Amino acid sequence: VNVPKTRRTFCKKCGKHQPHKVTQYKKGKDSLYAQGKRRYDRKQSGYGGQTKPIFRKKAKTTKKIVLRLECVEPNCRSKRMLAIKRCKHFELGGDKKRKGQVIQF
Amino acid sequence: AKSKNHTTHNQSRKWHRNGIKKPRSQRYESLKGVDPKFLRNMRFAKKHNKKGLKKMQANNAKAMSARA
Amino acid sequence: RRPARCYRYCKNKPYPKSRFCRGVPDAKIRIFDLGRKKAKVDEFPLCGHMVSDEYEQLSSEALEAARICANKYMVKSCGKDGFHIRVRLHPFHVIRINKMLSADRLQTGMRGAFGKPQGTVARVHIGQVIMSIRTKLQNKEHVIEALRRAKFKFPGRQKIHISKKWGFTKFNADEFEDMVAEKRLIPDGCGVKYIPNRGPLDKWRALH
Amino acid sequence: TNTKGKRRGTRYMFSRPFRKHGVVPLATYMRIYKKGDIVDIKGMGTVQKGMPHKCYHGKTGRVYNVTQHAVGIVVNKQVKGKILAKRINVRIEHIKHSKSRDSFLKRVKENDQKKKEAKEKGTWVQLKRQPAPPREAHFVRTNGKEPELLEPIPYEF
RNA sequence: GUCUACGGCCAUACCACCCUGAACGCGCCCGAUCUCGUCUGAUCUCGGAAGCUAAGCAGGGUCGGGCCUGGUUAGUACUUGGAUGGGAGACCGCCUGGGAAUACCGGGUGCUGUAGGCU
RNA sequence: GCGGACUUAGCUCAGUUGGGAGAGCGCCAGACUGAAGAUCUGGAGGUCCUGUGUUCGAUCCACAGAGUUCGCACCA
RNA sequence: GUUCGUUAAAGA
RNA sequence: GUUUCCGUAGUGUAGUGGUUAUCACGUUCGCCUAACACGCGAAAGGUCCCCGGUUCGAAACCGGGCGGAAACACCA
RNA sequence: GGGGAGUUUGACUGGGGCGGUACACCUGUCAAACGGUAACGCAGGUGUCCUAAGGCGAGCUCAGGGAGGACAGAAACCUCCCGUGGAGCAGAAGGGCAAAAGCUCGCUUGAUCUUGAUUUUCAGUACGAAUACAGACCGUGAAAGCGGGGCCUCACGAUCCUUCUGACCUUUUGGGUUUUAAGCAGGAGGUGUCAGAAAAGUUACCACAGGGAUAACUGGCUUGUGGCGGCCAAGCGUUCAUAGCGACGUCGCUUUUUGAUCCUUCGAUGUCGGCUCUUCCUAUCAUUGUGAAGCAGAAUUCGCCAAGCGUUGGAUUGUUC
RNA sequence: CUGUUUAAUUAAAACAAAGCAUCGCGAAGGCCCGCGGCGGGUGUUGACGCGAUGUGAUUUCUGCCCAGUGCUCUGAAUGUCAAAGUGAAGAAAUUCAAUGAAGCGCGGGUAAACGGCGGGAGUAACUAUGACUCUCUUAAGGUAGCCAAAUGCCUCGUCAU
RNA sequence: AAAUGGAUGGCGCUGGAGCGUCGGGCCCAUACCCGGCCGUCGCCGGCCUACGCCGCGACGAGUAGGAGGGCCGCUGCGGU
RNA sequence: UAUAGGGGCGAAAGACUAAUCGAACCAUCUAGUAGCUGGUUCCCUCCGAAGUUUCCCUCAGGAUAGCUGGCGCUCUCGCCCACGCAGUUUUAUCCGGUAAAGCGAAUGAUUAGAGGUCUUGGGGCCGAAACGAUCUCAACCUAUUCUCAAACUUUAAAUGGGUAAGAAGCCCGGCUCGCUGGCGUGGAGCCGGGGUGGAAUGCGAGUGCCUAGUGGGCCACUUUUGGUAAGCAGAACUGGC
Ligand SMILES: [Mg+2]
Ligand SMILES: [Mg+2]
Ligand SMILES: [Mg+2]
Ligand SMILES: [Mg+2]
Ligand SMILES: [Mg+2]
Ligand SMILES: [Mg+2]
Ligand SMILES: [Mg+2]
Ligand SMILES: [Mg+2]
Ligand SMILES: [Mg+2]
Ligand SMILES: [Mg+2]
Ligand SMILES: [Mg+2]
Ligand SMILES: [Mg+2]
Ligand SMILES: [Mg+2]
Ligand SMILES: [Mg+2]
Ligand SMILES: [Mg+2]
Ligand SMILES: [Mg+2]
Ligand SMILES: [Mg+2]
Ligand SMILES: [Mg+2]
Ligand SMILES: [Mg+2]
Ligand SMILES: [Mg+2]
Ligand SMILES: [Mg+2]
Ligand SMILES: [Mg+2]
Ligand SMILES: [Mg+2]
Ligand SMILES: [Mg+2]
Ligand SMILES: [Mg+2]
Ligand SMILES: [Mg+2]
Ligand SMILES: [Mg+2]
Ligand SMILES: [Mg+2]
Ligand SMILES: [Mg+2]
Ligand SMILES: [Mg+2]
Ligand SMILES: [Mg+2]
Ligand SMILES: [Mg+2]
Ligand SMILES: [Mg+2]
Ligand SMILES: [Mg+2]
Ligand SMILES: [Mg+2]
Ligand SMILES: [Mg+2]
Ligand SMILES: [Mg+2]
Ligand SMILES: [Mg+2]
Ligand SMILES: [Mg+2]
Ligand SMILES: [Mg+2]
Ligand SMILES: [Mg+2]
Ligand SMILES: [Mg+2]
Ligand SMILES: [Mg+2]
Ligand SMILES: [Mg+2]
Ligand SMILES: [Mg+2]
Ligand SMILES: [Mg+2]
Ligand SMILES: [Mg+2]
Ligand SMILES: [Mg+2]
Ligand SMILES: [Mg+2]
Ligand SMILES: [Mg+2]
Ligand SMILES: [Mg+2]
Ligand SMILES: [Mg+2]
Ligand SMILES: [Mg+2]
Ligand SMILES: [Mg+2]
Ligand SMILES: [Mg+2]
Ligand SMILES: [Zn+2]
C-alpha cells in the first residue's frame, strides 16, 4: 500500500494534533542478557539437546506493517506506533497516482 | 467408523422437563447500559433530591393537609 | 441407456437446465408440431387431448417415439396436411446417473455420490395434457385410435378426452360459430385473439 | 457447517418488497420513543448501520435507553437453554410502535369511564371482556319464498 | 372554487396525446457592472419587469396503458390433526378446522396540516 | 537475519587510484571470386538493472531496492 | 599458401 | 475411474508480465546455372480446438465440452 | 558422524491407502414462511487490495437505444431525445443505492488517544468482526450534521519469550549516584491441524490390548449391471407386420455374474480349483405325447403338458471360464 | 564343478569357491577392540603382506556419459567460518572493528564408485518398410550381444515344428 | 419361472369358515369402576415408646444412577 | 581351551547362543502404564435419564452445558375477594416467503402461428445500371400462444414465532437536575393523595448448594437430501424401543 511522509495524528504528550514523521518499524536486533535469553542459554548449556520448541510449520506469507510516528515539533519527540492490515508490497512515501493519465504501457 | 454427526432430536422434551423459565420479574429494573450523559444527569439529580427536597415538600404537605 | 424402471414417479426437486447444471446433453425431441403448421382456426373444428392420471415423469425419448407413432398413424389415416398435433408437454427436469465399474471394487465406493446429467424428463401433474390433436369433424375415430396407439407406449395409466373447446383456444365450440362472426374474436393464424371492451376506440374504428 | 456468520439466510427478509426501493420516509424518524414503550423490530436494507440481527426480526421488545439517533431495546430471545432478556442497540429506522398496547390503554380508559359512570349512577356494567358467547334462541324469517332445494351436480370433466 | 412556501400519506396522485386557465401567485423572459463559476450569463449567482399563458404549472378528457379496490376463478389448488380408508405402487377419497393467485368483468384516480394572497 | 559475488550491443566478455564506450560472434551495403569460405572497407545496434546523494561531470564513489548464486545461525 | 555435388542408354 | 499437462498456417514450435500472427521447414513466383540440387529476394497459407463469462479491449484469466499425453488404481 | 542412542509418522473418511479438505472464515439453496437444523450435498469463493477505493461538501447522471453531423467505415468526437437501476459500487454471490452509497472536482487524515456496555459462534467463555454511547484533539461543510476505515454480510491468532513505544513511573534486596535487568499499559514477531506439540518411511521377521464401532468368504435388503420374458407395432421376411423376427419406447422376473450397504461373525465359521458322492429346480439339449411353419419327404425352427431317465472320452491352462 | 545353508515346513536357481579386478597402508601407518594407559588383534607380520569390497570356472568381450550423489588432490589465490588473541569507546560489565584453522563453495580427476542410456514429422519408378535429411533436447542418448526367456500388461503376440 | 418338503398358523372352507356393506349378542388385559390388604406422599388429630398411636385422600412400573430404612447377616471391642 | 547379550559366533539362513533368538536366562525397579477386554459380593422402598450444544492431534476418550438425584430455605391456603405460573385457547397487534400460483410481469430457459415493413445477407423479374418499381427470405418489432425454474417472482396460504390482557396499572399536585433549552420547554428521578370487581381453563409457587450416569443409538406417520433401490447413508416435529 501507500502511506505519506507526514501525518497530523494525536500524540499523547501535548494533547493536540501535531504532524508526525512516519517511518518503517525495524524489527530490532535482540539484546543479550535479557531474562528469557539468559534462561534459554542456561537451559541450553548442557547435554539436553534442544529444550524449548523450535517453530517449523510457517504458513503466513505477509506481516502486519506498523509505522513509527515521531512528533515533528521540537523538544516533544513523542514516538508511537500505528498498525495497518496485512499487505504484500509496501511503498514508503512516494509515487502517488492520478486518474486522467494515459496508460502508455 | 462413520458416526451420527448432529441432530436436535429429543431436545424439546428435555427442555420441557423443567418448564422453561422467563426471568418474569425485575422490579426496579437494572440501570447499567443507559447513556452516561443521562447518568451524569440522574446521579446529581438524585443527590440534590436528597439535599433540597425537605422544606418545599414539607410546606406543600402542610398546604394540602390544610386544603384537604 | 438405463431402463425407465429406475427413472419413475417424482422423488426429487426439479433440476432444470440453468446456470448450475452446465453439463446436460441435448434432449431427444426438438419439434412439437408435425401436421399442417400454417393451418387456420376454421379449418380443423374438433380436437382430442390426452389426459394423465398418475403423477409421473415422462421421458423425452418416450415423447419422441410417441410423436413418431402418432405422426405415422395420422399420415396413414388422413394423409399429409389433414391434422395438427401438438405435444403440450415440454421436458425440463434433468435426471442424474451414478455409474460404476469404470468388474472390480477398486474404483470408488459411495465417496462422491453426486450424479452427472444423463437425460431430460418431464414431470407431469394429474390432469395435465400430454398431447392434443385438432382435426376435421370426420376424423373423430382416427384421433382416438392414434392416442390409443400412443397409450400403449406411454408408461402408466392415462385417459383420453375429446375437448368441448374449439381446438387449442379456451373458448367453447358451441359459442365459437355464434360469436366469432358478430363482435369479438378475430382469427390470428392458428391462434385466436380475444379483444375486451376496455380498449382504445381506434381499434373499434379500425374494425367494422 | 452452515457457516453461521451474520445474515446468512436473509435474501428476502432484509429486502424492501415492491414499489418501495428508494429513500426512507421521514415519519419513521418523526416518532416518540420513550422508556417503557413496547416496540416491534423490522429490518431495513436501506440503512446498513444498525440492523439488530437476523434472529430478532419480527420480535417485540421494551425500550430502556434512547440516544441521539438510535434506541436501546430489551428482547426476550429463546435459545437452547432458556429464554433470555437481551440488551440490543437498534437504530430508529428499523423500529416501529406496537398498536396492541395502545388498544389496551384505550380499553383501560373505556373501563375507567364506565367505572366512573357506574359509581355515579349505580349501574352494574359488566366491564370484564367476555369472549364470544354462544348464540341465543333467535328467530328466522322465510316469508315469500320456499327454501331453495339443492342437489349435487353430476361429474363432467 | 384556487394558488404559493414548507410538508405527511408515496403512482387512487406516473406515462402518451388533446382542450381550458378570469385576479394574485409560479414561470418563460430583458442583460452581465459589481458576488459568482463555466469553452459558452447554456447551468449557478447579480439589479429588473417590455410581452406571454406558446411551454413549465393547476384543472378536464381518452370505450387510454399502468396503480388500488371489489366480484369470478374458488370452498378450487393447498393445509393442522385422524383412521386396521382404498390402491401392488403412483397417489386418491372421507371426518375436523383454516383457506391463496392469473386470465374474465365492474369502480375510482388524489386526501390533508401549517403559514400567506387573490374572486 | 549476517557476510560476499554477477547484473552492459541480438549473444558472450572488457573498462575507477573516474572526462564516459571497446573486442569477438551476429546484421546490412559494396569489393575480391568462374561462384562460396577466408579476407578488406563503410554503417546500424548499449535503456551500461532502478532510484537517491557528493562532484563541474557517476558503468566504474557511497546508500537503499529489485532478479540469480555461495557459505553461516535458528526459544517467537 | 581452401571448397565446386548431379549430370541416363548410346551416339550409330 | 482419479490427479496434472497439452491443443497456434500443411508440420514442430516460440510468444502474454491481456493490446504481433513469430521462427525453420512444406508450396508458389522470379534470378544465377546448358539444365537440376544448393543458394538468393519475396508471396500465399491462422477459427491461436469449440461455446460462454470478466474487461475499453481475450487465444491468453476462468467455466463447461471435445481430442490427446503422463502418474496411480494397492491390502486381503 | 544412522557407527550408535531416544522420539514421531496428524484428523475427517460409506474399511484403510491414494484422491480431496467438507479441518479456519463467507454467499444462495438444501431448510419444511421466527430462529437453529446433516452428509466427502449442490453452485461459487477467502489468507488479498486501497493514502484512496476513507471522511465531508459541491456538481452531474448510468448501461443501452433512436436520429443527425467531413475524412469516420460496425466501433474515434460532439449534439437532441427516450432511458427504475436493466451500469457502476476492488475482487464469489446475496441484499441496498439515482439532485445516491455511482462518476468528477476542492480540502483532509476520525484508518487518532482512552474507559465502560451490547450483538455475533456461544457454555451465554475467549479471539475476530460489528453496533449505540461517553471523554479529549480534530477534518469537512454556510450550518444541520457526518466520520473513530472500506455501503453491509469474511478477509484473520492464546500462554511463555523477543522487540518497540509512554510516564521527568516502581523495584534493583544494609544506605545513596549511574549503567543494566525486572515490572506496568499497548503495537508487532506466530501457532493455516487456523481456541495453537517441535516430527520421515518400511516391516511378507513382526509383537501386544481390542473391534465385526471396521474391510477381505457366504448368508440378509436392492437389482444399477448380467441373464430371461411380456406389451403397441415402423419395418425384415420375393407380395404380405405378428411362420420366424422385430427398430423406437415401455412393464416385469431371477439371484446362475458383477455392483451397493455393513445386519451377524475378529477370545478364528479353515479362503480357489479338481476328484468322489447324494438330492432338488426348469428358463427342455435329447427321449414320450402334442399344436404351428415360408412343414412335399428328409432335416430343422417356434410353443404346451413334462425333470422320469440320460446329458461323454480327451490335448492344453491351477484354473472358474 | 566338489562343498555349505534355514536343528523342529524349504537343500535351491540361495551361500561359499578358484579366477578377474579395485581401494587404503613404508610401522609416529592401514582396518579394528577397549571405560582407562603410547593398553591390545592383525603382528613370531612388511606390498608375492595385511585389511575392505564388486563379479564369480574356460572362450570372446568390458560400448557411451563426472549433469547429480559420493570419494580424492591442490593453491591462506579467494568468499563464509567458532573458541583463544589484538585494537578502540566507557567507570566497568558490555559493544564494535580487523585479523580467518578444519569444513562448505570456487578448480581438476575418477564409473571393474552409486548410477543413467529419448520422444517427433516428411522421404526410393504398386503398396508398405523405410538407410538419407530438417528440428526440440540431454551429461550421455542402449554399442557389441539377447529375447516373449525365471525378464512382454495387451498376450493364449505372429510364423514353423 | 427356483432350487429340502410346507405354509391365510395348520386343519379345512364354496347356500362360506372367500369377497364388500352393515344389525343384535358374545369372549378377555396387569385397561376402567366398586371393594379388601401393604407401602409412599400430602393434609391433620391427641399432654400416648411423642422416633409412638390414630384419621382422610391421591398414587405405586423401570436399566445407568442417586437417596432413606432394615427388630437382614458375619467378625471383633466396651457397657449390659 | 577361547569368544557372553545389543554382546558372541555365523561357506550368510537375521540361522545358532542349553526345547526360548529380528536381541538368551534369573532377580530387582514393578503391584511399570493402558482412553483398552473380562469381573465387581444382602434385601426392601422412593425418584429416575442420555447417546445432544461447544472445545480438545479431538472420532473407542475427556472438559462444559443440558437431562437426574439428594439436602434444604423463603412464602401461600385452610374462616363482594387473594400473589403468581402454564408445551393451552381466545381478543388485539406485528413478523415471515414455504405449499400454491404466475412468467400476454423483472431474470433465466423454451414452442408455434399471424401482421407490419426499418435494415443488411441470399435467390428471381422489368434491363447498359439505378433504395426507379416489384416477388421471395432472414433478422427486428407488435399483439398472441405451449411448457417450466432448490439457487426466479407481482401475489400469497395453512401451520408457526413475539408482545399485551393492570395495584409493578391510571389520574392529580409539587420539588431536583451540573441532561436539554425561546418559554415552569421537554425528559428522568424524588415526594404526597384517590379509587384493585379488569379474558377462558387448570395448577399452591419462588430460590440456593453438592453430585452420579450420559457424551456408539435405532424405529414409525408426515416434510425432505444423495442414490436405481435397500432392513442404505444423512436432516425437521412428535411418539415409541
Ligand atoms: Mg557445550
Ligand atoms: Mg455420537
Ligand atoms: Mg428461505
Ligand atoms: Mg465579469
Ligand atoms: Mg471571475
Ligand atoms: Mg439569459
Ligand atoms: Mg395552453
Ligand atoms: Mg405555461
Ligand atoms: Mg389527466
Ligand atoms: Mg384505464
Ligand atoms: Mg393432511
Ligand atoms: Mg545422385
Ligand atoms: Mg535410529
Ligand atoms: Mg482415520
Ligand atoms: Mg419452520
Ligand atoms: Mg428459517
Ligand atoms: Mg432525457
Ligand atoms: Mg452484487
Ligand atoms: Mg442486484
Ligand atoms: Mg451528494
Ligand atoms: Mg467523540
Ligand atoms: Mg482445533
Ligand atoms: Mg516368500
Ligand atoms: Mg437390465
Ligand atoms: Mg456392522
Ligand atoms: Mg459385509
Ligand atoms: Mg449405519
Ligand atoms: Mg466347521
Ligand atoms: Mg430326478
Ligand atoms: Mg528341506
Ligand atoms: Mg570369468
Ligand atoms: Mg597398523
Ligand atoms: Mg561398463
Ligand atoms: Mg566435476
Ligand atoms: Mg510409394
Ligand atoms: Mg539395439
Ligand atoms: Mg391351504
Ligand atoms: Mg363377508
Ligand atoms: Mg419402584
Ligand atoms: Mg539370506
Ligand atoms: Mg530375510
Ligand atoms: Mg534353541
Ligand atoms: Mg524382533
Ligand atoms: Mg536386552
Ligand atoms: Mg492393579
Ligand atoms: Mg503388570
Ligand atoms: Mg467427537
Ligand atoms: Mg467397548
Ligand atoms: Mg457435567
Ligand atoms: Mg434439581
Ligand atoms: Mg428434585
Ligand atoms: Mg411450486
Ligand atoms: Mg457415580
Ligand atoms: Mg437413517
Ligand atoms: Mg413401549
Ligand atoms: Zn507532541
The cell for D22 is: 428508494
The cell for A34 is: 535479557
Minimal Cβ distance to D65: which of B11, B20, B33:
B33
Minimal Cβ distance to B34: which of D64, D82, D85:
D64
Q: Is D129 exposed, middle or buried (0-12, 13-18, 19+ CB in 10 A)?
A: exposed
Other CB atoms within a 10 A radius of the CB of residue C49 amount to 20
Residue with cell 416518532: D31
Cα B12 to the center of its chain, rounded Å? 30
Which 3 state secondary structure label does DSSP give A100?
coil
- Does residue B30 lie within 7 Å of nucleic acid chain I, judged by its CB? no
Which 3 state secondary structure label does DSSP give A85?
strand
Residue spans of alpha helices (H) in chain C: 60-77, 140-151, 173-179, 201-206
What Cα–Cα distance (Å) separates residue D153 from each residue in A32, C66, C83, C125, D156? 105, 37, 35, 25, 9
Dihedral class, residue C132 (left if φ above 0, else alpha if ψ from -120 to 50, else beta): beta
Contacts for C4 with CB less than 8 Å, ≥ 6 apart: C59, C62, C155
- Does residue D111 lie within 7 Å of nucleic acid chain L, judged by its CB? yes
Q: Is C151 exposed, middle or buried (0-12, 13-18, 19+ CB in 10 A)?
A: middle
What Cα–Cα distance (Å) separates residue D72 from each residue in C2, D14, D34, D42, D83? 63, 20, 10, 15, 19
Which of C44, C59, C76, C84 lies closest to C149 in space, CA to CA?
C76
Other CB atoms within a 10 A radius of the CB of residue A85 amount to 8
Rounded Cα distance, C197 and D10, in Å: 45
| Residue A87 annotated as lining a ligand binding site | no
Question: In the Cβ-directed half-sphere of C176, how many Cα atoms lie within 13 Å?
Answer: 19
Which of D12, D96, D94 lies closest to D50 in space, CA to CA?
D94
Q: Please compute Rg for chain A using Cα positions.
A: 21
Which of C55, C194, C56, C74 lies closest to C132 in space, CA to CA?
C74
- Between the CA of C206 and the centroid of ligand 16 the distance, in Å, is 56
Residue with cell 446456470: C19
What is the per-residue DSSP string for D47-96? Answer: --S----SSSTT-EEEEEEE-SSEEEEEEEE--SS--EEEEEEEEGGGEE
B15 touches chain D (CB under 8 A): yes
Determine the protein residue whose CA lies at the shortest distance from the C1' of I110.
Answer: A9
Other CB atoms within a 10 A radius of the CB of residue D71 amount to 23
Pairing mode, strands C129-135 and C84-87? antiparallel
Rounded Cα distance, A73 and A3, in Å: 20
Which 3 state secondary structure label does DSSP give C95?
strand
Contacts for C138 with CB less than 8 Å, ≥ 6 apart: none
Beta carbon pairs, B and D, within 8 Å: 25
